[PDB]
Amino acid sequence: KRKKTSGDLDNYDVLFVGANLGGICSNHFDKDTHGKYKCFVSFDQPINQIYSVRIPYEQQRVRKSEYIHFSKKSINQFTPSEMLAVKEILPEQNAVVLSSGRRIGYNQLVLATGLKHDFSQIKGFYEALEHPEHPVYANRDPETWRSAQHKYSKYISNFKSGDGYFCIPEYPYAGEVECFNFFVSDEVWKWAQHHGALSPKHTFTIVNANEKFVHYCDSADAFIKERLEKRGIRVEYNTKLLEVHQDGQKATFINTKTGEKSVRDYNNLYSIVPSKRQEFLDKAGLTNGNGLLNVDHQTLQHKKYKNIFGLGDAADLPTTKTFWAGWYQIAVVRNNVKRNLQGQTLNAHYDGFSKVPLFTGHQTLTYVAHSYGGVGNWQHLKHNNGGILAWMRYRSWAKGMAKKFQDFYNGARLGPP
Ligand SMILES: NC(=O)c1ccc[n+]([C@@H]2O[C@H](COP(=O)([O-])OP(=O)(O)OC[C@H]3O[C@@H](n4cnc5c(N)ncnc54)[C@H](O)[C@@H]3O)[C@@H](O)[C@H]2O)c1
């Protein structure tokens, strides 16, 4: 009946750059328009690691099959895709050049290029995270690990002794609140001190380069800091991890405020992988400052270039870059983009809603739900101190969310509402 559109073409009437949230949109853009347009997708990496369940992963509450998903699956069968990165974007020409060189034209462009992980900002990090024994752990799995490597789970369990550092890189970085495992670790290391598994000649400090944990929600940052103390955890601000020596287990830090670097023995290091701005977005004059797209806060349309959009993490938005945010930014992009193909006005506005669980304990969580102005809704920091209510919501996310990300990329389950 309906036939797959061509990938061997010279221009399309929509072009999506990304598969994770750029693909869920296309599958939504079709069901919203009934296939009246031919849309192309061009991602860069083959696998989509589901970082929304990254802590239930490290607890082995989610199997590796439910955490690793191919990028093709997000895209529907009809829409053609190719795993080639766009070399440059010519917005004045309405065109997009890929790595191979095949110039592609467009009518509307949707950018979901996220924040690109740059393991090389931290020298020697990747080669220590790939080692199946070294105590260097990170926010994501390398692609050379096979189905039988479960090093990720050993971070909390194998912390018998020594100095442990949890390092947060410089904003903008991916995985703000969803990759903070320093409250479940404390609980599990509070037991290990009680029966002797974890020595008392050990120190754990949070090396945060940024001044605050959550830039766009004051209430969450205040709660995190207040709760970090009540536990007894120590934080070091304005310090960022700069190098890792895998032989002697030395970690070179630098306090950007004073520019004064230190070297410290580690025996358990975790880092939230550091990102890096892509230059083809700055040669094209789209990004603003930090490297994020200069888009409207309400409609998500680019300030200049009325026909370019942007969503997800690539977009410069005053909210927490979560997934449930993007669930609301594809509903908006797929509307306006279609209103712009019909000439009509852009009637869909983004409220700034973003919802990410924060795990306060081994089996408890609280939701960070907040709109554009940092203002939280009825769930913001509820049942934060644990209890039967937070216990259940933990199971509903750990045992029941990874089973859903298959549908999202299928199409069988759409957004929350
Ligand atoms: N906790 C973490 O460390 C982490 C890291 C990445 C993503 N995430 C989650 O994923 C959610 C969605 O992320 P996103 O959609 O904003 O970005 P993303 O991290 O999912 O990646 C964006 C997609 O665009 C592709 N891409 C990047 N550069 C490209 C280029 N030059 N050309 C073509 N394709 C390119 C990528 O391969 C990818 O398919 C985020 O809200 C976040 O919750 C978390």
Residue numbers in the entry: 27 to 443
Sentences copied from the publication:
In eukaryotes, ATP synthases are found in the inner mitochondrial membrane. The type III ATP synthase was detected in ciliates where it induces tubulation of the cristae membranes. In this study, we present the cryo-EM structures of the type III ATP synthase dimer and tetramer with associated lipids from the model organism Tetrahymena thermophila in complex with the natural inhibitor IF1.
Using masked refinements, the resolution of different regions reached 2.5–3.1 Å, allowing de novo modelling. The Fo-wing clamps around the c-ring, and is formed by a 55-kDa subunit ATPTT1. The nicotinamide group of the NAD is in close proximity to Cys205, which could potentially be the active site of ATPTT1. Thus, ATPTT1 is positioned to encounter membrane-embedded electron-acceptors, such as CoQ, in a similar fashion as the human enzyme.
